[PDB]
Amino acid sequence: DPKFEAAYDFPGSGSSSELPLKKGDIVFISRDEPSGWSLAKLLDGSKEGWVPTAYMTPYKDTRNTVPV
């Protein structure tokens, strides 16, 4: 799966269907839905929950800018 970066805080409502984020957090994304929500998983796989698709931006580290 691809990795996405939280561009905004998402403290959410408290729901266990929600994955609360801080800015700069990095997650996997398995599903986007038309409601505007994305199904995010932490990198260690410990929690799974929906997040605002809008907050989620492709992760680019500056160590990724080399061919191999």
PDB file of N, CA and C in Angstrom:
ATOM      1  N   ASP A   1       0.822  -1.262   0.000  1.00  0.00           N
ATOM      2  CA  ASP A   1       0.000   0.000   0.000  1.00  0.00           C
ATOM      3  C   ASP A   1       0.848   1.303   0.000  1.00  0.00           C
ATOM      4  N   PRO A   2       0.262   2.395  -0.520  1.00  0.00           N
ATOM      5  CA  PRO A   2       0.889   3.727  -0.508  1.00  0.00           C
ATOM      6  C   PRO A   2       0.726   4.469   0.827  1.00  0.00           C
ATOM      7  N   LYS A   3       1.693   5.342   1.125  1.00  0.00           N
ATOM      8  CA  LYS A   3       1.739   6.107   2.386  1.00  0.00           C
ATOM      9  C   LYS A   3       1.328   7.565   2.200  1.00  0.00           C
ATOM     10  N   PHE A   4       0.482   8.066   3.095  1.00  0.00           N
ATOM     11  CA  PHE A   4      -0.021   9.435   3.029  1.00  0.00           C
ATOM     12  C   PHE A   4       0.262  10.235   4.338  1.00  0.00           C
ATOM     13  N   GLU A   5       0.436  11.541   4.182  1.00  0.00           N
ATOM     14  CA  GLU A   5       0.793  12.409   5.274  1.00  0.00           C
ATOM     15  C   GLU A   5      -0.390  13.262   5.659  1.00  0.00           C
ATOM     16  N   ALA A   6      -0.634  13.371   6.959  1.00  0.00           N
ATOM     17  CA  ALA A   6      -1.668  14.253   7.493  1.00  0.00           C
ATOM     18  C   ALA A   6      -1.168  15.656   7.360  1.00  0.00           C
ATOM     19  N   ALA A   7      -1.962  16.496   6.711  1.00  0.00           N
ATOM     20  CA  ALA A   7      -1.638  17.899   6.486  1.00  0.00           C
ATOM     21  C   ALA A   7      -2.333  18.764   7.505  1.00  0.00           C
ATOM     22  N   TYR A   8      -3.369  18.213   8.141  1.00  0.00           N
ATOM     23  CA  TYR A   8      -4.077  18.901   9.219  1.00  0.00           C
ATOM     24  C   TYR A   8      -4.349  17.947  10.374  1.00  0.00           C
ATOM     25  N   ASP A   9      -4.438  18.497  11.579  1.00  0.00           N
ATOM     26  CA  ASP A   9      -4.996  17.784  12.730  1.00  0.00           C
ATOM     27  C   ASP A   9      -6.405  17.308  12.429  1.00  0.00           C
ATOM     28  N   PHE A  10      -6.709  16.099  12.905  1.00  0.00           N
ATOM     29  CA  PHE A  10      -8.052  15.549  12.909  1.00  0.00           C
ATOM     30  C   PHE A  10      -8.286  14.937  14.288  1.00  0.00           C
ATOM     31  N   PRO A  11      -8.690  15.746  15.249  1.00  0.00           N
ATOM     32  CA  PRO A  11      -9.041  15.231  16.576  1.00  0.00           C
ATOM     33  C   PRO A  11     -10.348  14.467  16.570  1.00  0.00           C
ATOM     34  N   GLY A  12     -11.164  14.639  15.528  1.00  0.00           N
ATOM     35  CA  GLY A  12     -12.369  13.841  15.343  1.00  0.00           C
ATOM     36  C   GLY A  12     -13.482  14.101  16.352  1.00  0.00           C
ATOM     37  N   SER A  13     -14.346  13.108  16.516  1.00  0.00           N
ATOM     38  CA  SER A  13     -15.444  13.168  17.482  1.00  0.00           C
ATOM     39  C   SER A  13     -15.259  12.257  18.686  1.00  0.00           C
ATOM     40  N   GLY A  14     -14.358  11.277  18.580  1.00  0.00           N
ATOM     41  CA  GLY A  14     -14.151  10.290  19.624  1.00  0.00           C
ATOM     42  C   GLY A  14     -14.512   8.882  19.211  1.00  0.00           C
ATOM     43  N   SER A  15     -15.115   8.771  18.040  1.00  0.00           N
ATOM     44  CA  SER A  15     -15.616   7.507  17.518  1.00  0.00           C
ATOM     45  C   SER A  15     -14.508   6.519  17.287  1.00  0.00           C
ATOM     46  N   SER A  16     -14.792   5.236  17.503  1.00  0.00           N
ATOM     47  CA  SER A  16     -13.804   4.178  17.287  1.00  0.00           C
ATOM     48  C   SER A  16     -13.781   3.733  15.834  1.00  0.00           C
ATOM     49  N   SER A  17     -14.673   4.318  15.030  1.00  0.00           N
ATOM     50  CA  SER A  17     -14.645   4.218  13.566  1.00  0.00           C
ATOM     51  C   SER A  17     -13.677   5.232  12.973  1.00  0.00           C
ATOM     52  N   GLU A  18     -13.234   6.164  13.806  1.00  0.00           N
ATOM     53  CA  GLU A  18     -12.391   7.277  13.373  1.00  0.00           C
ATOM     54  C   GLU A  18     -10.973   6.966  13.782  1.00  0.00           C
ATOM     55  N   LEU A  19     -10.000   7.408  12.997  1.00  0.00           N
ATOM     56  CA  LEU A  19      -8.614   7.369  13.413  1.00  0.00           C
ATOM     57  C   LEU A  19      -8.232   8.814  13.611  1.00  0.00           C
ATOM     58  N   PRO A  20      -8.026   9.210  14.871  1.00  0.00           N
ATOM     59  CA  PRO A  20      -7.538  10.552  15.206  1.00  0.00           C
ATOM     60  C   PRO A  20      -6.098  10.774  14.761  1.00  0.00           C
ATOM     61  N   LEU A  21      -5.821  11.886  14.087  1.00  0.00           N
ATOM     62  CA  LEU A  21      -4.485  12.202  13.576  1.00  0.00           C
ATOM     63  C   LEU A  21      -3.927  13.504  14.137  1.00  0.00           C
ATOM     64  N   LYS A  22      -2.612  13.618  14.186  1.00  0.00           N
ATOM     65  CA  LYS A  22      -1.974  14.928  14.275  1.00  0.00           C
ATOM     66  C   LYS A  22      -1.317  15.268  12.929  1.00  0.00           C
ATOM     67  N   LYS A  23      -0.919  16.512  12.745  1.00  0.00           N
ATOM     68  CA  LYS A  23      -0.292  16.923  11.504  1.00  0.00           C
ATOM     69  C   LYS A  23       1.089  16.322  11.394  1.00  0.00           C
ATOM     70  N   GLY A  24       1.409  15.799  10.217  1.00  0.00           N
ATOM     71  CA  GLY A  24       2.704  15.175   9.967  1.00  0.00           C
ATOM     72  C   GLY A  24       2.721  13.667  10.151  1.00  0.00           C
ATOM     73  N   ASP A  25       1.618  13.132  10.670  1.00  0.00           N
ATOM     74  CA  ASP A  25       1.448  11.704  10.894  1.00  0.00           C
ATOM     75  C   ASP A  25       1.461  11.010   9.560  1.00  0.00           C
ATOM     76  N   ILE A  26       1.919   9.764   9.540  1.00  0.00           N
ATOM     77  CA  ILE A  26       2.040   9.006   8.300  1.00  0.00           C
ATOM     78  C   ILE A  26       1.297   7.686   8.430  1.00  0.00           C
ATOM     79  N   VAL A  27       0.438   7.412   7.452  1.00  0.00           N
ATOM     80  CA  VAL A  27      -0.448   6.238   7.459  1.00  0.00           C
ATOM     81  C   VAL A  27      -0.522   5.575   6.087  1.00  0.00           C
ATOM     82  N   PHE A  28      -1.084   4.390   6.077  1.00  0.00           N
ATOM     83  CA  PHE A  28      -1.434   3.739   4.834  1.00  0.00           C
ATOM     84  C   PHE A  28      -2.861   4.075   4.486  1.00  0.00           C
ATOM     85  N   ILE A  29      -3.203   3.955   3.222  1.00  0.00           N
ATOM     86  CA  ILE A  29      -4.584   4.153   2.813  1.00  0.00           C
ATOM     87  C   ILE A  29      -5.027   3.037   1.881  1.00  0.00           C
ATOM     88  N   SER A  30      -6.059   2.325   2.304  1.00  0.00           N
ATOM     89  CA  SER A  30      -6.577   1.196   1.560  1.00  0.00           C
ATOM     90  C   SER A  30      -7.809   1.568   0.742  1.00  0.00           C
ATOM     91  N   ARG A  31      -8.640   2.449   1.289  1.00  0.00           N
ATOM     92  CA  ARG A  31      -9.874   2.865   0.630  1.00  0.00           C
ATOM     93  C   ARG A  31     -10.156   4.352   0.697  1.00  0.00           C
ATOM     94  N   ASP A  32     -10.609   4.899  -0.422  1.00  0.00           N
ATOM     95  CA  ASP A  32     -11.229   6.218  -0.471  1.00  0.00           C
ATOM     96  C   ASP A  32     -12.729   5.950  -0.764  1.00  0.00           C
ATOM     97  N   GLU A  33     -13.616   6.742  -0.174  1.00  0.00           N
ATOM     98  CA  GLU A  33     -15.045   6.673  -0.465  1.00  0.00           C
ATOM     99  C   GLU A  33     -15.550   8.036  -0.936  1.00  0.00           C
ATOM    100  N   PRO A  34     -16.685   8.081  -1.643  1.00  0.00           N
ATOM    101  CA  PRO A  34     -17.245   9.342  -2.159  1.00  0.00           C
ATOM    102  C   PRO A  34     -17.834  10.275  -1.087  1.00  0.00           C
ATOM    103  N   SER A  35     -18.170   9.752   0.086  1.00  0.00           N
ATOM    104  CA  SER A  35     -18.520  10.585   1.252  1.00  0.00           C
ATOM    105  C   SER A  35     -17.444  11.623   1.626  1.00  0.00           C
ATOM    106  N   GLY A  36     -16.196  11.318   1.260  1.00  0.00           N
ATOM    107  CA  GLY A  36     -15.052  12.170   1.522  1.00  0.00           C
ATOM    108  C   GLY A  36     -14.091  11.560   2.532  1.00  0.00           C
ATOM    109  N   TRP A  37     -14.270  10.274   2.821  1.00  0.00           N
ATOM    110  CA  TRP A  37     -13.492   9.614   3.867  1.00  0.00           C
ATOM    111  C   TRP A  37     -12.535   8.574   3.290  1.00  0.00           C
ATOM    112  N   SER A  38     -11.393   8.424   3.957  1.00  0.00           N
ATOM    113  CA  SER A  38     -10.372   7.467   3.571  1.00  0.00           C
ATOM    114  C   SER A  38     -10.053   6.525   4.722  1.00  0.00           C
ATOM    115  N   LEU A  39      -9.945   5.233   4.429  1.00  0.00           N
ATOM    116  CA  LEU A  39      -9.659   4.244   5.454  1.00  0.00           C
ATOM    117  C   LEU A  39      -8.158   4.108   5.675  1.00  0.00           C
ATOM    118  N   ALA A  40      -7.702   4.667   6.800  1.00  0.00           N
ATOM    119  CA  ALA A  40      -6.282   4.789   7.109  1.00  0.00           C
ATOM    120  C   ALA A  40      -5.869   3.767   8.117  1.00  0.00           C
ATOM    121  N   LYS A  41      -4.635   3.284   8.003  1.00  0.00           N
ATOM    122  CA  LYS A  41      -4.034   2.359   8.968  1.00  0.00           C
ATOM    123  C   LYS A  41      -2.684   2.904   9.447  1.00  0.00           C
ATOM    124  N   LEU A  42      -2.383   2.844  10.738  1.00  0.00           N
ATOM    125  CA  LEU A  42      -1.050   3.271  11.183  1.00  0.00           C
ATOM    126  C   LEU A  42       0.035   2.382  10.566  1.00  0.00           C
ATOM    127  N   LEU A  43       1.290   2.846  10.578  1.00  0.00           N
ATOM    128  CA  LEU A  43       2.362   2.133   9.888  1.00  0.00           C
ATOM    129  C   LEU A  43       2.710   0.817  10.552  1.00  0.00           C
ATOM    130  N   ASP A  44       2.563   0.755  11.865  1.00  0.00           N
ATOM    131  CA  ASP A  44       2.789  -0.491  12.589  1.00  0.00           C
ATOM    132  C   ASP A  44       1.572  -1.412  12.572  1.00  0.00           C
ATOM    133  N   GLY A  45       0.471  -0.958  11.977  1.00  0.00           N
ATOM    134  CA  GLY A  45      -0.732  -1.764  11.829  1.00  0.00           C
ATOM    135  C   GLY A  45      -1.605  -1.873  13.070  1.00  0.00           C
ATOM    136  N   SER A  46      -1.329  -1.065  14.089  1.00  0.00           N
ATOM    137  CA  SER A  46      -1.949  -1.208  15.411  1.00  0.00           C
ATOM    138  C   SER A  46      -3.391  -0.653  15.523  1.00  0.00           C
ATOM    139  N   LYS A  47      -3.704   0.363  14.716  1.00  0.00           N
ATOM    140  CA  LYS A  47      -5.045   0.962  14.669  1.00  0.00           C
ATOM    141  C   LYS A  47      -5.502   1.241  13.244  1.00  0.00           C
ATOM    142  N   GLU A  48      -6.793   1.033  13.015  1.00  0.00           N
ATOM    143  CA  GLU A  48      -7.414   1.298  11.720  1.00  0.00           C
ATOM    144  C   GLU A  48      -8.698   2.127  11.934  1.00  0.00           C
ATOM    145  N   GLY A  49      -8.869   3.179  11.135  1.00  0.00           N
ATOM    146  CA  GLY A  49     -10.038   4.032  11.214  1.00  0.00           C
ATOM    147  C   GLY A  49     -10.079   5.111  10.158  1.00  0.00           C
ATOM    148  N   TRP A  50     -11.273   5.627   9.918  1.00  0.00           N
ATOM    149  CA  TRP A  50     -11.511   6.540   8.823  1.00  0.00           C
ATOM    150  C   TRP A  50     -10.978   7.912   9.121  1.00  0.00           C
ATOM    151  N   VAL A  51     -10.518   8.588   8.071  1.00  0.00           N
ATOM    152  CA  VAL A  51      -9.999   9.944   8.158  1.00  0.00           C
ATOM    153  C   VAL A  51     -10.490  10.776   6.975  1.00  0.00           C
ATOM    154  N   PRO A  52     -10.523  12.103   7.130  1.00  0.00           N
ATOM    155  CA  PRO A  52     -10.863  12.989   6.011  1.00  0.00           C
ATOM    156  C   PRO A  52      -9.852  12.887   4.877  1.00  0.00           C
ATOM    157  N   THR A  53     -10.306  12.422   3.718  1.00  0.00           N
ATOM    158  CA  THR A  53      -9.489  12.314   2.516  1.00  0.00           C
ATOM    159  C   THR A  53      -8.762  13.626   2.232  1.00  0.00           C
ATOM    160  N   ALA A  54      -9.431  14.723   2.561  1.00  0.00           N
ATOM    161  CA  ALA A  54      -8.955  16.063   2.280  1.00  0.00           C
ATOM    162  C   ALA A  54      -7.669  16.377   3.015  1.00  0.00           C
ATOM    163  N   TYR A  55      -7.488  15.781   4.188  1.00  0.00           N
ATOM    164  CA  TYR A  55      -6.278  16.027   4.982  1.00  0.00           C
ATOM    165  C   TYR A  55      -5.063  15.234   4.463  1.00  0.00           C
ATOM    166  N   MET A  56      -5.303  14.324   3.526  1.00  0.00           N
ATOM    167  CA  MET A  56      -4.315  13.308   3.189  1.00  0.00           C
ATOM    168  C   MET A  56      -3.622  13.615   1.891  1.00  0.00           C
ATOM    169  N   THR A  57      -2.299  13.733   1.971  1.00  0.00           N
ATOM    170  CA  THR A  57      -1.457  14.114   0.840  1.00  0.00           C
ATOM    171  C   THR A  57      -0.303  13.114   0.648  1.00  0.00           C
ATOM    172  N   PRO A  58      -0.020  12.720  -0.603  1.00  0.00           N
ATOM    173  CA  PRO A  58       1.064  11.759  -0.874  1.00  0.00           C
ATOM    174  C   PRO A  58       2.353  12.115  -0.120  1.00  0.00           C
ATOM    175  N   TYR A  59       2.986  11.093   0.442  1.00  0.00           N
ATOM    176  CA  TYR A  59       4.154  11.277   1.276  1.00  0.00           C
ATOM    177  C   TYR A  59       5.360  11.313   0.381  1.00  0.00           C
ATOM    178  N   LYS A  60       6.087  12.419   0.475  1.00  0.00           N
ATOM    179  CA  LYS A  60       7.359  12.515  -0.207  1.00  0.00           C
ATOM    180  C   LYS A  60       8.408  13.060   0.738  1.00  0.00           C
ATOM    181  N   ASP A  61       9.331  12.156   1.017  1.00  0.00           N
ATOM    182  CA  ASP A  61      10.545  12.361   1.761  1.00  0.00           C
ATOM    183  C   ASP A  61      11.623  12.699   0.724  1.00  0.00           C
ATOM    184  N   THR A  62      12.680  13.374   1.148  1.00  0.00           N
ATOM    185  CA  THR A  62      13.690  13.865   0.217  1.00  0.00           C
ATOM    186  C   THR A  62      14.762  12.811   0.032  1.00  0.00           C
ATOM    187  N   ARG A  63      14.615  11.686   0.733  1.00  0.00           N
ATOM    188  CA  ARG A  63      15.473  10.524   0.529  1.00  0.00           C
ATOM    189  C   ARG A  63      14.893   9.608  -0.566  1.00  0.00           C
ATOM    190  N   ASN A  64      13.690   9.931  -1.059  1.00  0.00           N
ATOM    191  CA  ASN A  64      12.983   9.143  -2.083  1.00  0.00           C
ATOM    192  C   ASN A  64      13.301   9.596  -3.516  1.00  0.00           C
ATOM    193  N   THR A  65      14.086  10.670  -3.632  1.00  0.00           N
ATOM    194  CA  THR A  65      14.378  11.300  -4.920  1.00  0.00           C
ATOM    195  C   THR A  65      15.671  10.761  -5.557  1.00  0.00           C
ATOM    196  N   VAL A  66      15.850   9.444  -5.491  1.00  0.00           N
ATOM    197  CA  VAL A  66      16.944   8.752  -6.165  1.00  0.00           C
ATOM    198  C   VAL A  66      16.357   7.510  -6.852  1.00  0.00           C
ATOM    199  N   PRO A  67      16.812   7.177  -8.063  1.00  0.00           N
ATOM    200  CA  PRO A  67      16.305   5.992  -8.783  1.00  0.00           C
ATOM    201  C   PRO A  67      16.273   4.662  -7.997  1.00  0.00           C
ATOM    202  N   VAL A  68      17.401   4.027  -7.650  1.00  0.00           N
ATOM    203  CA  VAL A  68      17.331   2.758  -6.896  1.00  0.00           C
ATOM    204  C   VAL A  68      16.561   3.025  -5.620  1.00  0.00           C
TER     205      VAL A  68
END
